[PDB]
Ligand binder design. Structure first.
Ligand SMILES: [Cl-]
Ligand SMILES: [Cl-]
Ligand SMILES: [Cl-]
Ligand SMILES: [Cl-]
Ligand SMILES: [Cl-]
Lengths: 510, 510, 510, 510
């Protein structure tokens, strides 16, 4: 019995990974293909939301750094106009003992209190000496931290912060993922800065970045998707997958529709995929994986951007005076992430949690703060108090004065927020993924393949691109299996226009 | 003024690298292409000669170990029959002080004289203690050797042997090339074997290998070339490139024929290429490279295979009692590498150099020995004596009895034999290659790109495949730039039939 | 009330330590002095017993190596005749798995079975690598052993043997005592000998030694004692100390005699001394010390010296097939340690424990074996079976054939045999000794000061000499407080005739 | 032919070493002895001079830290009255870049400029990392310095200062001598101090010291000499040795007197001694030694003690703005080192070298500065200028205002000042000293035995004491051969009243 639809390559999910697949499928223009998503708006976790008050919020505050020229190509194609983008410098700090320590923390001990400087420089001297002699490798994230930074910085920042964000102890995570995530501090340079009182916040791929002028980051993915042939997309309730029959290569949609595929690129969470397959073995396997949920909190506030806030981009909060691990001055990325000054809005509450002296709609201007709070079986959070707790936290960290007027609030919980690089992860993935591929199913993405090291938007996008390129041109999936390889190089070879398309164009013009 | 011929991609050279380009160009079947070679017979350095007496000789005794499924696919296509191949186990030894030390030498100290064992175990102990503390990297091949094996093994085997093959002292070479070439010995394992008297000759990719039943390895490349559209090839005097005009992208052949190209894949020696471009800058750059010439000496001998020879495949000769660094019992690979026993041949001489007691043509059977002797500006060789010196060497090493009857002899000198991994190499290549690429010229191959670590038949074949794959599909050239990456994995993704071809075939079906 | 006798310096005990004290007191001939001992025969633990059958036995088999010229002087004086001494070369072995391994064990791995050689060479490699990097110090004897020899040699010899002798686990002992006792094996030299099959039994002060022709080592001390003025000695029941009144410096003897002293040199076991002082605090401190008792077993056997025995001097037994840790072929030291061949003796029993076939007194010649067995609260021994058990052990270790005729037997238990270098030792001694000295009591000797590293006869002799030299001439007690100092040098300065006596002699000549 | 005088032991030189010998010869009161010196006043280099203006100057500013109770006893005997001594605390600083860095320099990096702190903390970090792994020993003082402090502190202080004092480059000196002279800095402690801004100037034996109320240190040795039997001393021109006839053990004095000896304790510089012996071999040997001369400069200045000067005791000057390596505020040690306030003196010059506005004799009070300048074949110094140069330096280092009134000046050059611990030293001494002893000559003292490690007054005194003790009581000369042993312990055994004298006294009481 024939399926309602038959394609060579079926793409499930229209987030960055899925759209990457679609883009390369569309570029090659060889096999037939189709992309579906239960959401009417493509973008997935890289989408932007809006409060009724006109405040925009990305899903946690997303800053792009591109490792791939291909990813750049597709962005330039979607938002080609110069004024589609703003370019910014990374102003990042960590909140430690009343003071803002420039990112990364481990490289800026100099901004700490004297007593704390001691504990830190001590830990590093120890670690540098043991390292001069070490011949074994760190078994856990935690060991790596101690080995690389010493007990001083471990206890002061690394350990408490990482629990606050991963929702699992540092001793429960693996060490291989953090090539380009965590900076290994040089003893000599660190003490030199302590002596001099200088800073060093240039480490990391976040140096300088682009942000879309309108629509938040979610705008990019809407623009990218628009380059696809509408009839090959199926977004909304009509595109919600409810069943995957690996054995006879057919997917079933919510509305009963059936799609037949030769090859399946799934970008939904691999545990949901296992469920949708009714494959008991895979379900059990995926159940060995671990993830944290993410609460994204949005706070719209009236007033000119306080000088105390300055041009800070994102801030890290290791201390326990606030529930959130990171905050972003989202209003700094684009003036279109919040209403214009002329827009009149009533004050909902003051930062201290009290009623405003006036509930009349007043003018702005406005600024915006975006928060993230992790959740897991090891770190539960109370949904009905988290917004209030977050706002208090903003007070406690002197992000807001208790008098500051709050004009808009945003709170949304994303079940699958972070794929946790646990000690167990690979043992599971090295079974799950191979077994899926033996069924002609490329499971890829932040939760498709579950590898955070390679879980950024560009990474995800390329996972989709490279899956297709593997399916069609026999390309090695570098991003999936070799995070350090792709992350350590400039990937310039693959382009939105490869030789193939050039030669075909010229043969058609004769 | 139009050229006689115009193709999208022109391939110069039909050795493995060139043919690799061809097979993928021919597979993709997109851009137009053409392949030329000055030799009527494709195969390059991987081809086979035959003496008038019917004894075959490869260019030094070639053994195939594949790192790529794609390579395997093309061999299977060209020689699909089970009985087209022989599969063998590596029986390799090193000749040291009257005894046969199993390969690798450094892993079998137990087979040496007691006095020599001491010198070696001592060396390793020292090295192992300094390694426990070392934090810098070796600057030369020689340092690497000392660090990894100790002075004992360095002076006994490594140092003398490597000069005898590379034709340059170990102190003039770089350390980066030897990932899978030189075995780093483990002190405990080595001494445990010395105590017990056990061996360990399983290290290396050569464990089990296959070899063509007929025509030598050259038979493979003739077969592979036959799967190409004949009309797209131009082999022989008609295909000899004499001039390359990079500025207007046209090549000129010996017979005056002009060929225009959009992309050039050049597999000739990059120094010859620079010469053919009349590009002074590149000629100067290429002259900073270094290579050794290779003398291949063949000796056909009458008699049943001596038990003293046994099933030995190839043998290493570090000592100075013979000029050759290696010997291959070529007759062991295939019964068709030498005449049948029923064939009658006259004896040309005895191993000791004297005349045969009888110049009548007697029967066999026969066995065959193939020698290699290196030459360079640092190690000259006398061509008119080398054959004789080699035969004497065979006597001194007890490979031949002074009474053994020589039936056939072979000697040929190949100017460009080994691309020497000198210290200066990369300094030159990282200038030569990029500058060539800016002219849309992909120089690839054993001398096309000059990197030995990736200079085997499968490496070369792939260098060509990947050059095309980069030109057409924007694939990254992994084999060229990341030897250790391609050598350390199973490269299974690229196939002689990719999804592209499958999907196009099914689209033409309906 | 005046005491019966009053001397300036009183010496309790006429072992080597006491005799040393006396000899220098007598040389200086300044302060008045006196030496007492409960034994009619001076010598203490360095005395010799005789069986009724005419078989001599030292208290464990004593071999002199002199660190002091002073010690040499007194022996030359006591036994000045050339033929008073025999000179020997140390032939020492360790009984391991049916074989005799030359001393020291850790230096002769070559003589072990192959399977065991591997275990050992492995341990040493591990330890050599850890050592290359170690920066801390060993906390226990055990740790020291591992660090210096590896787990292989530790489990095979060091750990089992050291318990067998010290009667306490190697984990319970300190590491500082073994400067010149335990050899630290060099990895390269060891493996070099395993490869070649050579030996290395020259390590240690025991190389070549001299032994008294007559009266066992006990003869020496009788002779030394005879050079003292008889009226200044009091040996026997008349010289047994029963009370020490530190407060009014008066000693009381068994026969009621009281002796007044200004300075006391006590060479009795320091725990006995505290008891004799009725000093509760010191008693409590001394009880923190630990010692092992020694069983000395003597076996006289009929027959020419078996060739299997050869010229072996002393032998170490780490295995558990015999209760003794060491055996000495005491008959080898001097022909006068056992009866002449012409002497007729009845056989008491056979080595297998059976009755002899003849109980008539037959002739010799004879040889003699001396054994040692340790006892402690951690290692009890059954006195009534130990002799039989020892004789069986001599059979199991093939020291005796079950047929060998045993002519004489000897067994005596010395309560204070070895002062155990426990972890707790120095904590107690650094209180005990100074507190005793504050009372003008120099407690010195193998059990007077309780320090094994400095507990040989010469050491003890010199402890007494230096004690007196401190009392009279303000000399620093080097042997007591700096074992490594005196052991690591040639002590040539102090002589039996110092300038003092030379100048006095010359002033009396005028 | 008999000598005019005959003694058992003859002592040449009445500095601290000679007087040490005499004191013990006098205590023992056994052999006959006699001490001679070419100076009417005993003290040697530890004697005091006086300027006509009434200003005292030690030979460089001598500060006593006693390692020996014996030394203490003799000083208590010579100067028994409480008010014979002043007790002080070590206030010591190093002059670096306009600031006073508390001694030791290496432990107080915090007091440096920020740019310099970096250079130093960097060097230590490097050093600490190499030390974690080092397994060889330093071949020179310089290497020791680098290894122990880093190139930072090496270039800033150690290297320049040590040449400025030793008159030789740090690379020309040996490493063994500096157990208690140079402090090995702990990285963690140093950086902790840099961070906190704290100090640490307690390291060293100089913590708290005592100084003779009257007569400078010279008063001590005058008082000590006075305790000797006058008739056994021969000081002055009458005591000047001119010949030493080692072969018939007779010494010849200036006035022709001949002294026969049995043992000779020579404290004159061993080079002069070899000369006096007319022993060619020893002359050659002694010429292999090296020494630096010492210029002592004394500056008396009118005025109350400037607050700028404070209670500083001695100060180190590594920088090249002054010729002197050390300065002492001698006036701070005792009020009797300079005239009383009431004394009237004319101003000789101003600190700037100009004439005084008034040559009338005005009152005080006064203060005194003592400087030291080194000289050698590698570092000449111009005698006629040095005084002025030194005064200028005092100006440059802001020790003196150019207006300060200089009342008195002192300058004297001591040919033998410092025995240089050169690399060659021991190779010479280990021949010189033993060869001398085979002749019954004990050469001892700062230049008698030439070892600086053990060349302070107490060390010297004891070298003499121990020499006599070796001659008479067969005592080991610990201070001569084991500097580290004596320096690292409290030497409490040898006293001015030993048991010997006590017992002899009580024997004569009966
Ligand atoms: Cl070529
Ligand atoms: Cl006792
Ligand atoms: Cl019998
Ligand atoms: Cl002198
Ligand atoms: Cl004036």
């Amino acid at each position: 019995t024939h399926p309602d639809i038959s394609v060579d390559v079926l793409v499930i999910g229209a987030g960055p990974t899925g759209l990457g697949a679609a883009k390369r499928l569309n570029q090659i223009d060889g096999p037939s293909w189709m992309i579906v998503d239960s959401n009417e708006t493509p973008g997935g976790l890289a989408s932007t939301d809006v409060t009724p008050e006109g405040f925009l919020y990305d899903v946690g505050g997303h800053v792009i750094f591109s490792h791939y020229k291909y990813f750049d190509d597709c962005l330039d194609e979607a938002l080609p106009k110069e004024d589609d983008w703003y370019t910014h410098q990374r102003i990042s700090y960590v909140r430690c003992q009343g003071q803002w320590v420039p990112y990364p923390f481990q490289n800026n001990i100099s901004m700490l209190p004297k007593e704390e400087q001691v504990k830190c420089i001590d830990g590093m001297i120890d670690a540098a000496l043991e390292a001069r002699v070490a011949n074994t490798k760190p078994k856990t994230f935690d060991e790596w931290i101690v080995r690389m930074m010493g007990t001083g910085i471990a206890d002061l920042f690394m350990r408490p912060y990482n629990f606050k964000v991963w929702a699992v102890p540092t001793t429960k995570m693996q060490c291989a993922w953090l090539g380009e995530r965590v900076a290994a501090p040089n003893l000599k340079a660190v003490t030199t800065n302590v002596i001099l009182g200088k800073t060093a916040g240039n480490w990391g791929p976040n140096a300088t970045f682009r942000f879309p002028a309108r629509g938040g980051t979610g705008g990019i993915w809407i623009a990218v998707a628009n380059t696809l042939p509408k009839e090959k997309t199926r977004f909304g309730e009509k595109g919600k997958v409810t069943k995957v029959n690996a054995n006879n290569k057919t997917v079933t949609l919510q509305d009963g529709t059936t799609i037949g595929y030769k090859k399946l690129v799934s970008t939904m969470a691999v545990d949901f995929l296992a469920e949708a397959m009714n494959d008991q073995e895979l379900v059990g396997l995926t159940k060995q994986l671990f993830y944290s949920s993410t609460h994204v909190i949005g706070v719209g506030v009236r007033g000119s951007r306080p000088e105390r806030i300055g041009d800070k981009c994102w801030l890290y909060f290791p201390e326990d005076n606030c529930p959130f691990y990171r905050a972003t001055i989202f209003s700094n990325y684009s003036p279109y992430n919040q209403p214009e000054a002329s827009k009149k809005l009533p004050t909902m509450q003051l930062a201290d949690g009290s009623r405003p002296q006036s509930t009349e709609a007043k003018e702005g201007p406005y600024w915006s703060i975006m928060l993230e709070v992790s959740e897991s079986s090891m770190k539960p959070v109370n949904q009905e108090t988290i917004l209030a707790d977050c706002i208090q936290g903003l007070v406690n960290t002197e992000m807001l004065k208790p008098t500051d007027e709050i004009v808009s609030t945003y709170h949304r919980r994303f079940d699958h927020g972070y794929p946790t690089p646990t000690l167990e992860r690979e043992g599971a993935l090295t079974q799950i993924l191979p077994k899926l591929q033996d069924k002609d199913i490329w499971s890829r993405g932040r939760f498709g393949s579950w590898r955070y090291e390679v879980g950024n938007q560009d990474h995800s996008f390329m996972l989709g691109v490279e899956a297709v390129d593997n399916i069609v041109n026999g390309a090695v999936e570098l991003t999936l299996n070799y995070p350090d390889f792709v992350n350590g190089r400039q990937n310039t070879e693959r382009r939105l226009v490869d030789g193939a398309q050039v030669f075909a164009k010229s043969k058609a013009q004769l």
